[PDB]
Design a binder for this molecule. Structure first.
Ligand SMILES: *[C@@H]1O[C@H](CO)[C@@H](O)[C@H](O)[C@H]1NC(C)=O
Lengths: 49, 43
């Protein structure tokens, strides 16, 4: 195990970058995380789809 | 794992009453047996 030595005088090739990894997939269980259903208003008394 | 229930205030009596769903849980778990839990007498 080695350590890091971050300092605020460094160049870009050594500055500490924050990284987060999102690994996601479905299971045959019900989907506990969906997306956006696009926003839109609601009209009445019109033949609509 | 679905649960239906109803709470109606008053050997079982005689009557008809349909039960409504309360929860629905997408668990995936298999079930083959179960037990119950009771509140004992200690005081
Ligand atoms: C439940 O048990 C059956 C065998 O009785 C098995 O084939 C099935 O894959 C099990 N279901 C789950 C979700 O593990």
């Amino acid at each position: 195990l080695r350590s890091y030595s971050f300092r605020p005088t460094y160049g870009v090739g050594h500055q500490p970058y924050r990284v987060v990894v999102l690994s996601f997939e479905l299971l045959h269980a019900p989907a506990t995380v969906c997306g956006p259903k696009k926003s839109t208003n609601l009209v009445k008394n019109k033949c609509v789809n | 794992f679905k649960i239906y229930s109803k709470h109606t205030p008053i050997d079982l009596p005689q009557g008809f009453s349909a039960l409504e769903p309360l929860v629905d849980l997408p668990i995936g778990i298999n079930i083959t047996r179960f037990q119950t839990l009771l509140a004992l007498h200690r005081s």
